[PDB]
Each structure stands twice: as C-alpha cells, then as structure tokens.
Paper text:
Chitin, a linear polymer of β-(1,4) linked N-acetylglucosamine (GlcNAc) forms the rigid inner layer of the cell wall and is also partially hydrolysed during morphogenesis. This is performed by glycoside hydrolase family 18 (GH18) chitinases that catalyse the cleavage of β-(1,4) glycosidic bonds between GlcNAc residues. In contrast, “plant-type” enzymes are predominantly cell wall associated endochitinases. Here we describe the discovery of novel, low micromolar chemical inhibitors of Aspergillus fumigatus family 18 plant-type chitinase A1 (AfChiA1) by high-throughput screening (HTS).
Author numbering: 25 to 312
The structure:
Amino acid sequence: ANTNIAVYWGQNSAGTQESLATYCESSDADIFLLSFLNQFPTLGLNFANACSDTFSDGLLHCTQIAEDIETCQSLGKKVLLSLGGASGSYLFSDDSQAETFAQTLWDTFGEGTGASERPFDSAVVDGFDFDIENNNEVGYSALATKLRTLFAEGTKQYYLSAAPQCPYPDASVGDLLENADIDFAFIQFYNNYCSVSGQFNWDTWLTYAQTVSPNKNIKLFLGLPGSASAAGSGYISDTSLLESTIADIASSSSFGGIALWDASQAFSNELNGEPYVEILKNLLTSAS
Ligand SMILES: Cc1ccc(OC[C@@H](O)CNC2Cc3ccccc3C2)cc1C
C-alpha cells in the first residue's frame, strides 16, 4: 500500500459521472470519497445528480448509492463519507458540540445502534474524510478522537482522512492533522505555490508524518486534478514528470499513493485512448 488510488465521487466534475459502483468495478481505484456531507451539524448531503430522493424532512435518502457502497465493499474497496467541500454550510461552535456530532455520524452512517434516519439504509461507510475548506478548525480533532472510541463498537476497520491543501500548516485541517489519529492525508498539490511544478513541498509533509502526526503510520497522498478541466491549474499530463515525481516520493513508508478530483474526470479523461486514472495506477505499481 504505496499503490492506492483515492477518488472523490459525487460532485460530477466532468458532467458525465456514472454510478459509484461503475467506478468500483473499474480496478483503477481503491478508496472512494463520497462528496459531500456539505451541511452539519444539522445534516445535509449533496451528490449532484446521483441522488435526489429525500426523507420527509429533506435529508437525502439514497438507495442506489447504498446498494453501490455494499457492492464496492464486496470488491474490497473502501468508501468514506467526505465532510465539507466548497459550500462552507458547516461549522462547530466547540469541542462538546463536535463530540455529540461523532455519535450522530456513528448512528447515521456507521454501526451505531441509535435509531436515526439513515441516508444509506443498512449500508455502512468505512469512515470519514475531512475536506474542510472554510478556514475554521474548531471541533474536528475532538470529533475524530471521539469517533475512534466509537469505532471499537463496530465489526470492521474504520478510516479517517483529511484533505489539506499543500501549504503547511493547513488553515482548515491543520489542527486535526496535528492532534488526532488520521489514516490518510489527501494533500492537494495544485492551485497553490507548492504544486508539483511550483515549489513542491512534499518534504514538509514528510516531516509532518515522521515527527508531528500522532499516527506515525499516516499515509500521505499526492492530490491532483483528474483532468485539465477538473481544476483551474496543476493538472499533470507529462508522464515523465509523473514518473520522476512518484520516484522521489515513493522512497518512504509514509507514501500512500495518489488522490484525484474526481472519479468522473479521472475516468473519462483519456491520454489519448487510455483513462487518466489507469495511467496513474500503473505508474504507482511500477514504482513499487
Ligand atoms: C458543485 C461543487 C463542486 C465541488 C465542490 O467542492 C470541491 C472541492 O472543494 C474539492 N476538494 C477536494 C479535496 C481534495 C483532496 C485531494 C485531491 C483533490 C481534492 C479536491 C463543491 C460543490 C458545491
């Protein structure tokens, strides 16, 4: 597992986004981040065109995504629910509020037995990604830590991740990354000074993993756009640059692989017949 590919799914960056299970059945990706629980602590989900049904109270109710989560899991994929994204319709006032919210997540999305409305029926996520983008850090470390306690009650391994941008420390998930046990850091090396072709600062994140992260086994991911149209800048089509980049970063145990925004883009974008996500997967496997 220096060879994992993580993809965001749910926000249909490419327009042509297919079902979650379609991408799990592909073999080019290992970890799927459902984008997003964009409203909290008062729960709200958004998955663009992939789910429109609701409970009476307006909370999304997503029977096809639920079935696909189960299919994905049977095929050995991990499926995390991603909190946040670009909306900022989310904020904690304090750690206590965020700790209460851990229970809410556990009973709504995990193996908690507390009866609440379950957007994915009896399907159970494999954990949570913290894609916090509003530059407010209150509550996340306490939420993460409480979740770790609750996960012991479950019957499988759960994962927590965060999605910083490359500048260090991150203004939204820096405190989380420094103060809680996190499995994966999906670090965005684009739209920033520290992108791969800018002043690439992998070395800083390595220092973080080795000396700061409460989990010394945290895995770091090279976070990239999945196509030229998936973000404004920092898409890498130069496969020599990708090879050399992977070469440099794969020579520690802290390297986890590559994270992509998003499935729709990375799977549909071809060089020039071959899916971008497949190019990357094979580069990871060669390097290991
Ligand atoms: C329509 C829409 C599309 C994207 C939205 O949020 C997109 C971004 O915030 C994506 N954050 C992820 C976080 C991450 C981690 C590694 C590699 C890439 C990326 C991008 C929100 C809305 C409402």
